[PDB]
Amino acid sequence: SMQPEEFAAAARGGFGGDAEKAKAAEAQEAMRQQMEEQRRIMLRAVLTPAAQERLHRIQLVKADKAREVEALILQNAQRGRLADKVDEATLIELLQQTSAASAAKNTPKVTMRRRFSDDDDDF
């Protein structure tokens, strides 16, 4: 789908300017999920949990940390709650802040030089 044929793309790598390629190409892979989206994924979008609460709070203080946390949820809270094809980073962040109980990371300038396993420190 790139004319003229004489001066076609012939990239053979991913896209090379042709936004279309990135669309279809990525689709072939994303299709791995093989399931209902516009129907199921959308059917869930309707309702919504109350996570916004804790999120609005934890984010109220962790601004810089909230921007990185929203990056992921951006494809879940807005995507209509996949509740099936949930990304992988979704949990990576939920644990980066406190998989169970810990909090704190290393900013803003909150790290007193070399952190420590909160759980271990038991303090």
Cα radius of gyration rounded to whole Å, the chain: 21
Which tokens belong to 115? 């952190």
Distance between CA atoms of 117 and 57, rounded to whole angstroms? 24
Backbone dihedral region for residue 81 (phi beyond 0: left; psi -120 to 50: alpha; all else: beta): left
Q: Return all residues near 2 (Cβ < 8 A) that are at least 6 apart.
A: 8, 9, 18
Name the DSSP class of 37. Answer: I
CA angle 93, 102, 94 (to 5 degrees): 15
Q: Return all residues near 96 (Cβ < 8 A) that are at least 6 apart.
A: 105
Q: What is the largest CA-CA distance in the chain?
A: 70
Q: Give the residue from 25, 77, 86, 16 showing the smallest Cα distance to 51.
A: 77
C-alpha atoms less than 13 angstroms from C-alpha of 2 in its C-beta half-sphere: 14
H helix runs in the chain, sequence order: 19-30, 42-45, 52-61, 63-73, 89-98, 118-121
Distance between CA atoms of 24 and 99, rounded to whole angstroms? 36
